[PDB]
Amino acid sequence: KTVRWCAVSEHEATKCQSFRDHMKSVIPSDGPSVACVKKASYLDCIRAIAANEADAVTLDAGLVYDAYLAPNNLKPVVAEFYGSKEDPQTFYYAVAVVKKDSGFQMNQLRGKKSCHTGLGRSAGWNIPIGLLYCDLPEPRKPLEKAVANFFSGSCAPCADGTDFPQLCQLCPGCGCSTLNQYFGYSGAFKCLKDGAGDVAFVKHSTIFENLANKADRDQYELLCLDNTRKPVDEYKDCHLAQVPSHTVVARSMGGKEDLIWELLNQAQEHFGKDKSKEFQLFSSPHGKDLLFKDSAHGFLKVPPRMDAKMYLGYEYVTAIRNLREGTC
């Protein structure tokens, strides 16, 4: 009945010990219980779990990918959802928004200008650049220069514009802060709305956050991997990658997922959003996003026998592998 959670820092351990202590204060010992393990990094927790030294850890998508790999063979078991119970979000979609009828598809991106949320961000850089990897003109290493060589001018916040200036052409300096009008989520969208670039690599919610009505959203379009375009509302059938926000992983064999979901469900019921004032699962006096993201609403039980690469999606896996392996 004891689930050994892995923390990757001292605040997470403290929060874990407190979570544990409150759970004991509300459940019959025949119920699920927490044990707090403390590691130095997500990868050290992944290894501990595989090594039967811990049972569960919640991770972002790239780490879910790593945990899956051998010798780890960890698998997704529970997800954090957001938004609502009716319409619970567990994923975000990396999309490629463009101006209506700007006459080019995903496979025709070479020679256009790009707006990225920031270099190194998943939806804004990793996912799209990973997907386009082999389209980039060689020499492909260093990647920054190749990207600069693929687009006629870009805005890649946090890029080394001293060495690859073309990357800041749309935002001189590639300022890695909001001091740069083209930084982050709204920044990249503004870059395209302003007509500075042809395409904006952002997540689906971004355009909805920046545009009032359908009419507004209708001057825009999304590029689909099948080299066709579709309305922005259709992002679910037209995205670069469907990415899980935060996923709990456990050993594929002997992971105790059964008990893990029990603890987490009984956890959400007892101290989920609004449920408790003595203990809050999605906050902590000790820090932001300790163990679970603070913006989480609860958990959903992930589909039975859900292989990681299936949970991540063929595209995401392709992107990561391209960026890691550089094989073409």
From Swiss-Prot:
Binding site for hydrogencarbonate 1: T117, R121, A123, G124
Annotated positions binding Fe(3+) 1: D60, Y92, Y185, H246
Disulfide bridge positions per record: C6-C45, C16-C36, C115-C191, C134-C328, C155-C171, C158-C176, C168-C174, C224-C238
Residue ranges of domain Transferrin-like in the record: 3-325
Tissue note: Expressed by the liver and secreted in plasma.
Coiled-coil portions: none
Location of the protein in the cell: Secreted
Glycosylation site list: S29
Modified-residue entries (Dimethylated arginine), positions: R20
Written domain comment of the UniProt record: Has a bilobed structure, each lobe binds a single Fe(3+) ion. Does not always bind 2 Fe(3+) ions.
Recorded disease: Atransferrinemia: A rare autosomal recessive disorder characterized by abnormal synthesis of transferrin leading to iron overload and microcytic hypochromic anemia.
UniProt record similarity statement: Belongs to the transferrin family.
Subunit-level organization: Monomer. Part of a complex composed of SLC40A1/ferroportin, TF/transferrin and HEPH/hephaestin that transfers iron from cells to transferrin.
Stated role: Transferrins are iron binding transport proteins which can bind two Fe(3+) ions in association with the binding of an anion, usually bicarbonate. It is responsible for the transport of iron from sites of absorption and heme degradation to those of storage and utilization. Serum transferrin may also have a further role in stimulating cell proliferation.
Protein name: Serotransferrin
Highest classification ranks of the organism: Eukaryota, Metazoa, Chordata, Craniata, Vertebrata
Gene this chain is encoded by: TF
Part of the full-length chain shown: 23 to 350 of 698
